[PDB]
Structures are given as structure tokens and as C-alpha cells.
């Protein structure tokens, strides 16, 4: 029992973190096989960020201008290319610690673990989610760029995010491991507003199911609702619309607790309309939306 | 910017996790050098837990009754002893992945990372704190015993906790790596009530400092208070008394923000007396107490 914001063990990803320096800029790189993946803004100075032309800036760089350090040993760069907003630095040594891996592009509402790094060294691990506005509410300081987001399925590490940016609003933006930004963000130091940060309804429902499993049942009411009625209330409260795909995805949690999905929706509806009244659910005073139904099942079953 | 409940990278501790089986009971062990540390209740059946006499139960066990598996390879047990509530299983192979380590006994209010394990395999990592009542609010299922709590200082892993128990209240109890329980808990399946779970005031103040650094300043008021006046309010709200040692420990955060410790105490006092009014601080609707002043500084500075 007990329910925690849990991240995947970071060991497999720590073994991939390297330091990439280009000129006076230093950030993190991900070393998988004989390729080092890093944000392309490693080639920029702070002044360049206002209006960078990456292709032109890259012309003035050669393999030897990219310094890659794994531990206290330097890696030899034998090739370099730009794929969208990431640079692929081909090195002469395959990473002996390369885990089994995939590059996946996640959807909003999907959660992942981040291994925050500075100078190629891991400093911390936390769990977060891709917000519906395509931002992540991370914890990143200057130099954290190149830190990655990932999920683990037994032994396979699915890399889904690479950190690139902090918007003026203090939220974060980044790309998948192919260099494509999540959302409409660009790697320029320019006015970029995130968009409405809606609550991930399916994740809130999953977390309400986790609360019932773990004993917090005070919020359970005697009502039920329909998808349409529930969505009228969800829209008013800046909650994402709930689909039949979401109801289907909550099926196993519905079965384990004996609580139909639409009954849990009615309980959520009253929590939105009446507030918590100074009460908590799993030690939280707000409705948590950064646990997917898969995370709730994984944590409550004990997947290793 | 951004502030997250961050755990230490778990890699160094993942390399120590082994599976210990005795008879029909299986739990986790910590393999450091040629010794495997595990809860002594690995020798008990579910029936034995009601009234175990560990010394007598242990007499019927020999080195060969303890099965240690690291990965898919079995380790040879060449010696066994009971130190308080942990068993030390001497194996014939020193762990090739032993990090630099210490066994420390933490105080209440101190935070640590837990690598939750099942069958010697890591399943997740989260950050928690030793509560003032000596319980931990973890996330542990049956089979999680032997999972450890730790802190990392650069390359040294300080092991501070080993999971043993879940109290009827759903909270957790465990020992330091010498087998001594935190608090008055015993490894018996018997009625054990935790005691008042007070809020760690010094940690709440540290987190209020983190909020100011990260831009959430709405709670800052025009008042100040004294340690005695503040403590009269803190007692009423089940908050731990604040000492001059705590004020001293908050000095660097006070300096970085320009906010005197007693001014932050007055802000906290009004938050306790008036509530949040539907507002949040670092995306939380309650006052967070599981970040020490050291954690706030570490996260805000970027210690690797
Ligand atoms: O946002 C960052 C990094 C960053 C990330 N997370 C958190 C940050 C916190 C503080 C400062 C910076 C942070 N950029 C890079 C900073 C420069 C450092 C020197 C060399 C040239 C880049 C600016 C842009 C990238 C893309 C579009 S604007
Ligand atoms: O509390 C646990 C483990 C546990 C921990 N965290 C979470 C748990 C969740 C569910 C069940 C159990 C949990 N004990 C061990 C369970 C037995 C399993 C079979 C063999 C004999 C022991 C009972 C006691 C230990 C000390 C005093 S009473």
C-alpha cells in the first residue's frame, strides 16, 4: 500500500550520459551505440540564440570542434549530422553500456521519467508527464540540456524526450530523439507562450482508482454520469475530454475495484463542483494527473 | 526553474540488489562487498510473524538454506549471522559493482531516495522522508522487503534505511543497515500504532524558499515573528517546533532570497491560519515537508 510519484530506475540511462562541449557551450549527450545525441543548440553562443540559423552555424564546425567526454575519458568524433533539432555525433567507440532501446514519440498525457544531468553527470530522477499543451513541468537549470525522458519495459529503454528549452513561463520544451519538438516550440530565444495547460482526465481517474485500492474512499459518491454529461463539466474545469478509448483503458482498474468508470466520473464531477473541503486524497490536496492508468496498474502490481 | 520531488540516480544501488530466498519466503537483499544484508524475517513463514522468536527460528537454518541470486546467477553462502533485525549473509564473491558506501542512521525530517525492489529486481525510485513518528510514507507491496533508502554524496552511497514492514495504517517501518528499527517498531505481526505524524517545519520553510527562488511569491506577507510566537502557532497546527539550529540551517536560503528566516516563519504562520484559499505553491495545494534545506540548495544549484 501507499502511492508514490515513482520514476523508473535510472541506471540504464546513467550509463549513456556523456558531456558534449562545442566552443564555450557545454550540455549533455545521450551515447547509444557509436552515436551521441545532443541538442543542436550546443553550437550556439548565448547571443546566437536570439536568431540562430543552425545550418549556417554548423558549416563552421568540424568533427574536432565537438568534444565528447564519457566519465573522465574523451571520445573521438568521426562524423556529425543535424537531424531536425538534434545533432548526431558519430564516435569511434560503441557505448559498452548501451541498453536495449527504442526512440518513441509520446502523446500528451503520457508519463515518463527524466534523469536530470549537468556536465554529463546525473544529478536526479523524477517522474513527469507531457502536458496537453506539449510542455513538461520539469526541474531544469542552465546546462541541463540533453537530459532525457524515458520509459522502461523490463530491459528495453524507450527514449521519448530530450530537454532543450525553458520557456519564459518557467515550463520546459524539448524534442523526441529524432529532433522534432513536442508542440509548436522552436529552439530560438523568442516569445513562445505554451497554450492552455489542461488536466489529463484519464490520469486523474486512474489516480482516483489508485486511491480506492490504497484505502482513500471518502470521495466515492452514490452517483453515476454519462460521457457527455461528464465532459460538459470537464470542459468547464479545463479538463481534457474523456473518450470511450479512455473508458476502455480504465477497464482493468474498474474491474479490480468494482467501480464502473462512469461512477468514478460522477465522483470526479462532484470533486470538481464541491472541492476537497480541506481534505486529501493519497496525501494530496489537488487532483493528481501525472499517473497514467498503466502507471497505476504497474505500481499497484509491482512490475520489475 | 521548476521544483520537483527528485530522487538520487539509482544506478549505484541497482548494482547491489539481489534476491534472497529462505524456504518459501523471498525478499530483497543488499549485496555490498562479500556480505548480503536482508530483513531477518526472511526466515519466517506468514504464521511465524504473529509471534516470532528469531534466534530459535535461525537455529534451524544453515548457510545452504539461504538462496542468494544476483541477476540469473546464484551466489554461494559461506556464513550467516543476525545483527539486530537484519541478517548478514557472507557470500564467496565480493560484489564487482560495490560503490563507495557508508551505513548511516538518519534523524526524523531527513529525506532519502528508495529503490523499490521485488525478487531482487528494481521496479521504481521515489523520494521520501523519515517522518517525526519514525514511519515512512512509501509505496511498498508484499515482497518489497529488503528495498533500501539511500543518499548519494558525489560517489559515496549512504545507506540509511532497509524496508521491513507495513503497519495496519498503511505506513511503513524499517531499520538502518545495522538492523535497528527506526522508532519503536518490532518485526512482529502485532498491533503497532505509529504516533502523531507532525509536519517537518524546517522542510516546509526550505520549500517556501524554493518557491520564492522559482517565482511563486504570492504567499509573502509584510509580517515578521519570533521563534517563540511562531512555535505557539506551529504546535497548534501539529508542526514540529523550530529551533535556532533550524534557523541556522536555513541561513543560505535566507541569504539567496534576501528573506529573513523569521519573515518566512510569519508567512508560514499566515498560511497556516488562513489556508491557501484555493491557490497553489509550486503546483501544490498543501505545504510540502519532504524537502530538506540541503535538498532545496542541491536542486536549485545542480549538484551532480
Ligand atoms: O533554455 C535554454 C536552456 C535551459 C533549459 N532549461 C532550463 C534553463 C534554465 C536557465 C537557463 C536556461 C535553461 N536555452 C539555452 C541556453 C544557452 C546556454 C549558453 C549557450 C547558448 C544556449 C535557451 C534556449 C534554448 C532553445 C531556445 S531558447
Ligand atoms: O509487513 C510485511 C511485509 C510488507 C511490507 N511492505 C508492504 C507490504 C504490503 C503487503 C503485505 C506485506 C507488506 N510483513 C512480512 C510479510 C510476510 C511474507 C511471507 C513470509 C513472512 C512475512 C509482515 C511483517 C513484517 C514485520 C512485522 S509484521
XYZ file of C-alpha atoms and ligand atoms in Angstrom:
664
model
C 0.000 0.000 0.000
C 0.922 3.680 -0.383
C 1.104 5.530 -3.672
C 4.136 7.490 -4.766
C 5.174 9.546 -7.790
C 7.649 6.892 -8.855
C 10.299 7.111 -11.559
C 11.874 4.151 -13.408
C 15.293 3.044 -12.009
C 17.784 5.324 -13.870
C 20.808 3.004 -14.037
C 20.411 2.008 -17.680
C 20.190 5.694 -18.743
C 23.023 6.852 -16.403
C 25.310 4.513 -18.408
C 24.528 6.575 -21.550
C 25.091 10.100 -20.254
C 28.039 11.935 -21.718
C 29.194 15.585 -21.762
C 29.213 17.414 -25.100
C 31.135 20.700 -25.479
C 31.251 22.853 -28.592
C 33.300 26.022 -28.235
C 32.208 27.578 -24.954
C 28.830 25.746 -24.692
C 28.533 22.564 -22.662
C 25.477 20.352 -22.422
C 24.576 16.662 -22.057
C 24.573 13.985 -24.758
C 22.993 10.526 -24.929
C 25.506 7.873 -26.079
C 23.784 4.881 -27.713
C 25.933 2.506 -29.798
C 28.521 4.734 -31.656
C 26.263 7.822 -31.826
C 25.953 10.714 -29.347
C 22.606 12.559 -29.483
C 22.510 16.125 -28.179
C 20.503 19.410 -28.695
C 21.712 21.211 -31.817
C 21.940 24.486 -29.824
C 25.274 23.139 -28.440
C 26.808 25.052 -31.441
C 25.284 28.379 -30.325
C 26.556 31.116 -28.067
C 24.019 32.959 -25.819
C 23.892 35.763 -28.480
C 23.245 33.252 -31.315
C 20.061 32.020 -29.558
C 18.088 35.173 -30.416
C 18.050 34.352 -34.126
C 20.055 31.163 -34.895
C 20.479 29.773 -38.418
C 21.622 26.308 -37.393
C 22.665 25.205 -40.878
C 24.995 28.233 -41.237
C 26.375 27.901 -37.683
C 27.026 24.194 -38.281
C 29.064 24.888 -41.509
C 31.781 26.437 -39.289
C 32.017 23.231 -37.177
C 34.118 20.168 -37.858
C 34.158 16.782 -36.023
C 37.052 18.032 -33.828
C 35.050 21.069 -32.595
C 32.655 18.692 -30.722
C 34.250 17.412 -27.552
C 32.615 14.316 -26.091
C 33.568 13.093 -22.650
C 32.192 9.867 -21.083
C 33.366 9.690 -17.488
C 36.864 11.207 -17.477
C 37.730 9.806 -20.942
C 37.340 11.643 -24.245
C 35.549 10.007 -27.202
C 36.781 10.534 -30.788
C 34.193 12.191 -33.089
C 34.408 10.642 -36.581
C 31.208 12.164 -38.073
C 28.449 14.707 -37.373
C 24.989 15.470 -38.758
C 21.909 17.505 -37.870
C 18.564 15.738 -37.723
C 15.856 18.340 -37.107
C 16.826 19.920 -33.676
C 19.349 17.274 -32.559
C 22.924 16.633 -33.573
C 24.087 13.073 -34.085
C 27.787 12.824 -33.275
C 29.269 9.564 -34.602
C 32.043 8.410 -32.296
C 34.706 5.707 -32.883
C 33.607 3.670 -29.808
C 30.279 1.935 -29.327
C 28.953 2.504 -25.777
C 29.737 -0.692 -23.852
C 26.777 0.149 -21.578
C 24.176 0.558 -24.366
C 20.909 -0.941 -23.083
C 18.207 -2.362 -25.415
C 16.480 0.791 -26.713
C 13.817 2.431 -28.908
C 13.091 6.037 -29.898
C 9.422 6.708 -29.408
C 7.307 9.834 -29.749
C 4.789 10.010 -26.919
C 1.318 11.617 -26.880
C 0.121 14.278 -24.358
C -0.929 12.754 -21.053
C 1.790 10.120 -21.289
C 4.234 9.980 -18.425
C 7.978 9.397 -18.373
C 10.981 9.555 -16.066
C 13.667 12.245 -16.526
C 17.267 11.814 -15.495
C 18.331 15.448 -14.905
C 22.047 15.828 -15.833
C 24.745 18.560 -15.706
C 28.133 18.196 -17.489
C 27.190 14.622 -18.492
C 26.682 13.605 -14.841
C 23.319 12.519 -13.428
C 22.057 14.660 -10.598
C 18.484 13.427 -10.054
C 15.496 11.484 -11.321
C 11.844 12.482 -11.297
C 8.589 11.466 -12.906
C 6.673 13.849 -15.112
C 4.133 13.940 -17.989
C 3.857 15.503 -21.415
C 1.239 18.209 -20.766
C -1.695 18.591 -23.207
C -0.088 21.936 -24.279
C 3.174 19.957 -25.109
C 5.227 21.398 -22.281
C 6.742 19.462 -19.371
C 6.809 20.764 -15.811
C 10.361 19.705 -15.103
C 13.152 20.861 -12.870
C 15.955 22.053 -15.090
C 18.727 24.610 -14.640
C 21.116 26.043 -17.270
C 23.300 23.175 -18.523
C 20.530 20.531 -18.167
C 20.005 20.424 -21.945
C 20.407 16.968 -23.422
C 18.872 15.367 -20.264
C 16.407 12.664 -21.415
C 12.939 11.348 -20.677
C 12.392 7.624 -20.896
C 10.206 4.659 -20.041
C 11.457 1.086 -19.342
C 9.642 -2.124 -20.358
C 11.603 -4.911 -18.490
C 15.029 -4.336 -20.172
C 14.100 -2.036 -23.106
C 14.567 1.713 -22.597
C 12.182 3.779 -24.724
C 13.684 7.237 -25.090
C 10.885 9.722 -25.653
C 12.223 13.160 -24.721
C 15.394 15.249 -24.851
C 15.406 18.534 -22.963
C 16.147 21.696 -24.940
C 14.400 24.701 -23.533
C 12.860 26.694 -20.740
C 10.032 28.995 -21.879
C 9.675 32.473 -20.232
C 6.872 30.923 -18.131
C 9.324 28.522 -16.408
C 7.896 25.442 -18.137
C 10.018 23.227 -20.373
C 10.120 22.275 -24.014
C 12.050 19.600 -25.826
C 12.151 17.090 -28.667
C 11.762 13.329 -29.237
C 15.122 11.506 -30.061
C 14.625 12.359 -33.753
C 14.946 16.128 -33.068
C 11.269 17.019 -33.529
C 9.910 19.354 -30.855
C 6.878 18.350 -28.878
C 4.387 21.066 -29.679
C 4.994 24.250 -31.625
C 8.205 25.239 -29.900
C 11.339 26.250 -31.726
C 14.920 26.363 -30.420
C 15.070 30.199 -30.519
C 15.237 32.657 -27.588
C 11.963 34.254 -28.612
C 8.456 34.860 -27.211
C 6.783 31.475 -27.015
C 3.596 31.039 -24.986
C 2.673 27.438 -24.116
C -1.135 27.292 -24.563
C -3.851 26.111 -22.076
C -2.494 23.581 -19.593
C -5.465 21.262 -19.232
C -5.786 18.487 -16.673
C -5.327 14.925 -18.013
C -8.794 13.454 -17.064
C -7.912 9.808 -17.805
C -4.876 10.114 -15.450
C -6.960 11.759 -12.718
C -9.417 8.815 -12.958
C -6.543 6.301 -12.808
C -5.222 8.059 -9.668
C -8.728 8.008 -8.116
C -8.706 4.235 -8.761
C -5.240 4.034 -7.052
C -6.702 5.921 -4.084
C -9.592 3.421 -3.736
C -7.132 0.465 -3.927
C -4.965 2.127 -1.252
C -7.921 2.838 1.087
C -8.836 6.510 0.497
C -12.558 6.115 -0.285
C -14.211 9.243 1.226
C -14.709 10.812 -2.234
C -16.826 7.890 -3.516
C -20.398 9.085 -4.047
C -23.771 7.431 -4.812
C -23.985 8.978 -8.314
C -23.223 7.992 -11.871
C -22.939 10.101 -15.058
C -22.621 9.736 -18.860
C -19.585 10.563 -21.042
C -21.470 13.582 -22.482
C -22.664 14.952 -19.102
C -19.218 14.353 -17.577
C -17.489 16.136 -20.478
C -19.750 19.230 -20.092
C -18.341 19.526 -16.522
C -14.799 18.539 -17.555
C -14.710 21.314 -20.215
C -15.840 23.929 -17.656
C -12.958 22.912 -15.354
C -10.216 22.867 -18.074
C -10.113 19.051 -18.009
C -9.367 17.083 -21.185
C -12.423 15.463 -22.813
C -12.821 11.794 -21.837
C -13.271 9.331 -24.743
C -14.515 5.701 -24.967
C -10.783 4.829 -25.567
C -10.091 6.271 -22.076
C -13.036 4.280 -20.541
C -11.593 1.141 -22.243
C -8.105 1.934 -20.891
C -9.570 2.236 -17.347
C -11.343 -1.172 -17.659
C -8.814 -3.207 -15.593
C -8.870 -0.622 -12.758
C -12.689 -0.600 -12.944
C -12.627 -4.440 -12.633
C -10.139 -4.539 -9.759
C -12.093 -2.016 -7.668
C -15.629 -2.984 -8.758
C -16.281 0.693 -9.561
C -17.671 1.394 -13.033
C -15.786 4.084 -14.979
C -18.843 6.374 -15.213
C -19.417 6.076 -11.426
C -15.786 7.210 -10.903
C -16.511 10.046 -13.393
C -19.503 11.151 -11.237
C -17.267 11.127 -8.138
C -14.721 13.281 -10.027
C -17.540 15.619 -11.172
C -18.593 16.239 -7.533
C -14.931 16.764 -6.502
C -14.688 19.424 -9.232
C -18.009 21.069 -8.291
C -17.529 20.936 -4.488
C -13.767 20.961 -3.965
C -11.916 18.854 -1.398
C -13.203 20.828 1.674
C -9.738 20.776 3.265
C -9.388 17.006 2.741
C -6.717 14.983 0.937
C -6.623 12.004 -1.493
C -3.397 9.961 -1.254
C -1.934 12.821 0.817
C -2.653 15.357 -1.932
C -4.943 18.434 -1.713
C -5.352 18.644 -5.512
C -6.327 16.022 -8.097
C -3.154 14.403 -9.458
C -2.941 13.925 -13.227
C 0.631 12.645 -13.781
C -0.096 8.909 -13.341
C -1.463 7.078 -16.370
C -3.733 4.021 -15.973
C -0.653 1.919 -16.934
C 1.405 3.547 -14.124
C -1.325 2.858 -11.561
C -1.534 -0.818 -12.573
C 2.303 -1.133 -12.731
C 2.794 0.385 -9.285
C -0.096 -1.453 -7.681
C 1.010 -4.838 -9.169
C 4.793 -4.473 -8.743
C 6.194 -4.681 -12.284
C 10.018 -5.005 -12.327
C 13.479 26.716 -12.770
C 10.750 24.298 -11.654
C 10.839 22.258 -8.475
C 10.357 18.517 -8.416
C 10.322 15.761 -5.799
C 13.609 14.390 -7.071
C 15.309 11.133 -6.132
C 19.051 10.380 -6.439
C 20.020 8.423 -9.618
C 19.529 4.745 -8.569
C 22.209 3.081 -10.716
C 24.756 2.575 -7.946
C 22.116 0.888 -5.721
C 20.584 -1.178 -8.589
C 24.027 -2.842 -8.909
C 23.662 -4.103 -5.302
C 20.164 -5.578 -5.407
C 19.952 -9.324 -5.053
C 17.131 -11.810 -4.332
C 17.227 -13.720 -1.042
C 15.040 -16.821 -0.556
C 14.773 -18.869 2.619
C 12.350 -21.776 2.415
C 9.194 -20.364 0.856
C 9.904 -16.669 1.677
C 11.534 -14.418 -0.895
C 12.643 -10.847 -0.345
C 15.393 -8.448 -1.460
C 18.982 -8.276 -0.214
C 21.658 -5.582 -0.487
C 24.994 -7.015 -1.710
C 27.963 -4.893 -0.581
C 31.447 -6.453 -0.782
C 31.021 -10.190 0.199
C 28.018 -9.604 2.504
C 24.291 -9.676 1.662
C 22.094 -7.649 4.047
C 18.419 -8.582 4.273
C 15.473 -8.407 6.799
C 15.738 -11.237 9.322
C 12.039 -12.088 8.738
C 13.199 -13.881 5.530
C 13.379 -16.990 7.836
C 9.697 -16.681 8.832
C 6.542 -18.103 7.338
C 3.347 -15.943 7.415
C 2.256 -17.896 10.571
C 5.635 -17.293 12.296
C 5.144 -13.495 12.030
C 2.484 -13.412 14.768
C 4.993 -14.316 17.476
C 8.487 -14.969 16.013
C 11.482 -15.966 18.151
C 14.148 -15.161 15.580
C 17.011 -16.787 17.480
C 15.118 -20.120 17.662
C 13.943 -19.931 14.025
C 17.508 -19.168 12.913
C 18.935 -22.283 14.735
C 17.108 -24.453 12.154
C 18.830 -22.615 9.247
C 22.196 -23.369 7.711
C 24.166 -21.387 5.061
C 22.640 -23.593 2.310
C 19.046 -22.722 3.348
C 19.632 -19.081 2.208
C 19.493 -18.819 -1.552
C 21.049 -15.667 -2.981
C 20.593 -14.792 -6.624
C 22.262 -11.770 -8.310
C 20.893 -11.457 -11.826
C 20.342 -15.032 -13.032
C 23.409 -16.378 -11.163
C 23.397 -17.933 -7.696
C 25.854 -16.763 -5.010
C 27.429 -19.250 -2.562
C 26.614 -18.530 1.119
C 29.683 -19.275 3.279
C 28.456 -17.705 6.567
C 25.382 -16.174 8.233
C 24.689 -14.036 11.303
C 21.884 -11.962 12.802
C 22.602 -8.360 13.721
C 19.531 -6.926 15.450
C 16.714 -7.216 12.768
C 18.933 -7.882 9.727
C 20.725 -10.989 8.563
C 24.231 -10.690 7.182
C 24.822 -13.438 4.630
C 28.541 -13.811 3.848
C 28.968 -14.892 0.244
C 32.102 -16.238 -1.521
C 32.082 -13.420 -4.142
C 32.613 -9.731 -3.489
C 30.110 -7.626 -5.485
C 32.032 -6.319 -8.508
C 29.581 -3.381 -8.587
C 30.057 -2.306 -4.937
C 30.007 1.509 -4.874
C 31.785 3.575 -2.168
C 29.394 3.300 0.801
C 28.525 4.126 4.429
C 25.809 2.923 6.815
C 24.230 5.918 8.454
C 21.310 6.309 10.838
C 19.242 9.336 9.868
C 17.133 11.625 12.092
C 13.394 12.412 11.573
C 12.838 15.058 8.920
C 15.754 13.757 6.870
C 14.980 12.730 3.329
C 16.235 9.822 1.249
C 15.600 8.010 -2.019
C 14.117 4.480 -2.047
C 14.732 1.966 -4.789
C 11.594 -0.220 -4.537
C 12.511 -3.835 -5.488
C 10.707 -7.191 -5.978
C 12.603 -10.518 -6.338
C 15.918 -8.600 -6.297
C 14.878 -6.502 -9.321
C 14.395 -2.730 -9.174
C 10.929 -1.569 -10.086
C 10.953 2.143 -9.190
C 12.589 5.030 -7.375
C 10.966 7.717 -5.258
C 11.930 10.332 -2.720
C 10.595 10.220 0.804
C 11.396 11.343 4.387
C 11.700 9.761 7.802
C 8.542 11.089 9.495
C 8.801 12.576 13.022
C 6.838 9.480 14.239
C 9.604 7.248 12.623
C 7.430 5.892 9.844
C 7.956 6.402 6.106
C 5.122 7.033 3.669
C 6.416 4.707 0.995
C 4.930 2.640 -1.768
C 5.602 -0.979 -0.958
C 3.802 -4.215 -1.802
C 4.385 -7.724 -0.377
C 7.884 -8.826 -1.430
C 9.362 -5.279 -1.261
C 11.197 -6.087 1.986
C 14.929 -5.517 1.785
C 14.408 -2.481 -0.539
C 16.740 0.315 0.666
C 16.760 4.039 1.327
C 19.900 5.951 0.494
C 21.528 9.307 -0.135
C 24.469 9.953 -2.534
C 27.299 12.453 -1.930
C 29.151 12.578 -5.344
C 30.210 8.869 -5.483
C 29.512 7.706 -1.888
C 26.191 5.950 -1.240
C 24.986 6.391 2.343
C 22.559 3.579 3.085
C 20.146 4.735 5.763
C 17.063 2.515 5.538
C 16.029 -1.065 4.801
C 12.327 -1.774 4.410
C 10.780 -4.374 6.714
C 7.182 -3.645 7.476
C 3.802 -2.202 6.678
C 1.821 -1.144 9.768
C -2.003 -1.702 9.817
C -2.315 2.024 8.980
C -0.614 1.525 5.573
C 2.538 3.400 6.602
C 5.954 1.747 6.591
C 8.568 0.802 9.130
C 12.125 -0.355 8.717
C 15.664 -0.387 10.081
C 19.041 1.287 9.439
C 21.694 -1.089 7.824
C 22.681 -2.285 11.317
C 19.225 -3.865 11.903
C 17.925 -1.280 14.384
C 14.353 -0.170 13.710
C 13.592 3.482 13.271
C 11.166 4.201 16.068
C 9.558 1.716 18.420
C 8.550 -0.812 15.801
C 9.251 -4.502 16.071
C 9.268 -7.127 13.305
C 6.105 -8.859 14.627
C 2.623 -9.001 13.040
C 1.088 -7.239 16.016
C -0.851 -4.042 16.824
C 1.563 -1.174 16.327
C 0.264 2.394 16.117
C 2.687 4.948 14.639
C 2.229 8.074 16.817
C 1.435 11.707 15.754
C 2.640 12.447 12.231
C 3.798 16.032 12.606
C 4.820 18.318 9.763
C 8.585 18.929 9.389
C 8.633 22.787 9.827
C 12.265 23.281 8.737
C 11.488 21.397 5.465
C 8.318 23.422 4.865
C 10.408 26.622 5.254
C 13.064 25.274 2.861
C 10.314 24.514 0.300
C 8.858 28.031 0.761
C 12.368 29.336 -0.027
C 12.428 27.075 -3.166
C 9.069 28.556 -4.178
C 10.403 32.142 -3.895
C 13.514 31.207 -5.964
C 11.251 29.612 -8.600
C 8.879 32.622 -8.778
C 5.872 31.690 -6.597
C 5.807 34.730 -4.278
C 2.073 35.364 -3.605
C 2.341 33.956 -0.051
C 4.995 36.503 1.013
C 3.494 38.850 3.602
C 4.559 42.117 5.304
C 4.925 40.463 8.743
C 7.666 39.004 10.880
C 7.508 36.806 14.016
C 9.750 35.384 16.780
C 10.760 31.730 17.320
C 8.519 31.593 20.434
C 5.450 33.201 18.783
C 5.933 31.056 15.664
C 6.213 27.868 17.750
C 2.933 28.646 19.612
C 1.226 28.557 16.163
C 3.313 25.613 14.912
C 2.291 23.489 17.950
C -1.413 24.251 17.353
C -1.078 23.020 13.746
C 0.873 19.788 14.562
C 4.089 21.286 13.151
C 7.469 20.372 14.653
C 8.994 23.061 16.902
C 11.533 25.235 15.058
C 14.948 25.627 16.760
C 17.865 28.089 16.306
C 19.681 25.086 14.655
C 16.894 25.107 12.014
C 17.204 28.939 11.548
C 20.997 28.420 11.126
C 20.396 25.611 8.602
C 18.093 27.941 6.587
C 20.754 30.729 6.539
C 21.991 30.133 2.945
C 18.403 30.093 1.589
C 17.672 33.249 3.620
C 20.778 34.877 2.024
C 19.975 33.799 -1.533
C 16.404 35.135 -1.384
C 17.013 38.147 0.894
C 14.162 36.917 3.118
C 14.982 36.614 6.821
C 14.059 33.251 8.377
C 11.596 34.817 10.851
C 9.867 36.723 7.997
C 9.416 33.368 6.185
C 8.089 31.966 9.507
C 5.466 34.782 9.630
C 4.436 33.964 6.041
C 4.078 30.282 7.043
C 2.070 31.315 10.145
C -0.462 33.199 7.961
C -0.642 30.242 5.517
C -1.499 28.011 8.496
C -4.050 30.467 9.938
C -5.704 31.420 6.610
C -5.190 28.409 4.353
C -4.280 28.588 0.666
C -7.728 29.921 -0.485
C -7.736 27.558 -3.479
C -4.219 28.627 -4.523
C -1.061 26.579 -5.084
C 2.670 26.886 -4.206
C 4.959 25.077 -6.682
C 1.832 23.379 -8.078
C 0.887 22.006 -4.654
C -2.304 22.757 -2.649
C -0.702 21.714 0.666
C 2.579 22.726 2.316
C 5.283 20.240 1.292
C 7.583 18.962 4.042
C 9.688 16.277 2.292
C 12.478 18.573 1.016
C 15.225 19.440 3.485
C 17.137 22.747 3.234
C 20.033 20.675 1.769
C 17.710 19.231 -0.933
C 16.461 22.701 -1.881
C 20.021 24.036 -2.228
C 21.172 20.867 -4.095
C 18.300 21.011 -6.574
C 18.458 24.758 -7.070
C 22.283 24.699 -7.583
C 22.561 21.497 -9.656
C 24.770 19.185 -7.580
C 25.870 16.069 -9.533
O 16.509 27.487 -22.481
C 17.697 27.234 -22.625
C 18.383 26.222 -21.726
C 17.647 25.978 -20.424
C 16.901 24.834 -20.212
N 16.292 24.509 -19.063
C 16.417 25.350 -18.043
C 17.137 26.566 -18.105
C 17.283 27.443 -17.005
C 18.016 28.589 -17.124
C 18.612 28.925 -18.332
C 18.494 28.106 -19.417
C 17.762 26.893 -19.339
N 18.453 27.849 -23.565
C 19.857 27.504 -23.837
C 20.804 28.435 -23.088
C 22.138 28.892 -23.716
C 23.353 28.494 -22.878
C 24.659 29.055 -23.444
C 24.863 28.652 -24.899
C 23.648 29.024 -25.746
C 22.357 28.446 -25.159
C 17.896 28.926 -24.361
C 17.069 28.384 -25.485
C 17.047 27.053 -25.991
C 16.139 26.925 -27.068
C 15.507 28.083 -27.359
S 15.986 29.388 -26.347
O 4.754 -6.208 6.553
C 5.288 -7.158 5.998
C 5.847 -7.015 4.595
C 5.258 -5.847 3.829
C 5.965 -4.674 3.634
N 5.548 -3.633 2.901
C 4.362 -3.733 2.311
C 3.516 -4.861 2.425
C 2.265 -4.967 1.772
C 1.509 -6.096 1.901
C 1.943 -7.152 2.692
C 3.144 -7.089 3.337
C 3.977 -5.947 3.218
N 5.389 -8.371 6.590
C 6.109 -9.510 6.001
C 5.154 -10.435 5.256
C 5.356 -11.965 5.260
C 5.537 -12.542 3.856
C 5.615 -14.070 3.860
C 6.714 -14.576 4.787
C 6.560 -13.992 6.190
C 6.489 -12.463 6.155
C 4.753 -8.615 7.871
C 5.588 -8.079 8.992
C 6.957 -7.689 8.951
C 7.403 -7.238 10.216
C 6.434 -7.278 11.156
S 4.935 -7.870 10.558
